Design a protein around this nucleic acid. Sequence first.
RNA 1: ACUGAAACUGUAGUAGAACCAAUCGGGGUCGUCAAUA
Length: 88
Amino acid sequence: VGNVVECLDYIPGRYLLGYIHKTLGEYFDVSQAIAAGDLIITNATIKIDGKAGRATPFCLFGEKLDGGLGKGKGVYNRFQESEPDGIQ
RNA sequence: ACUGAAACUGUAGUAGAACCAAUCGGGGUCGUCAAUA
């Protein structure tokens, strides 16, 4: 956007494609696999619990003053929980 | 169903102005000393 580039907080799988070509392209036709769907390289997301971190579900809601996942409390799964009495 | 490329946080700017390390002072001159028996 003009003279600034904003950055993602994950690595998209397309950036690893050139590495997939370089390392494995001699063992199979990588381009053919891509076209056929025989290859998936996922996004690289932050490692949590020793595994790929999973994008925070939008069905989670924080108590606006005192809650949310950053505050570690007052997090409601609105797929399963009614909105509390008097708390936005 | 495929990483954009390429681009010097540089350019100009005197840590300086002001402030006496100074003020006063004849290299001079006279009475004892000591405490017992």
